[PDB]
Design a protein around this ligand. Structure first.
Ligand SMILES: [Zn+2]
Length: 44
């Protein structure tokens, strides 16, 4: 599947950039907390 298993180097959910020191596990770590928050309506 195309839109199934992929790997990103940043967080397009909150427009965040992952540092170079971070590992594959780190990226997924935040990717889970980001989607877990479901807060994509930041109006500040
Ligand atoms: Zn995020």
């Amino acid at each position: 599947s195309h839109m199934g298993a992929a790997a990103l180097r940043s967080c397009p959910m909150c427009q965040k950039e992952f540092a170079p020191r971070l590992t594959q596990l780190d990226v997924d770590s935040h990717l889970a907390q980001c989607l877990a928050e479901s807060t994509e309506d930041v109006t500040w």
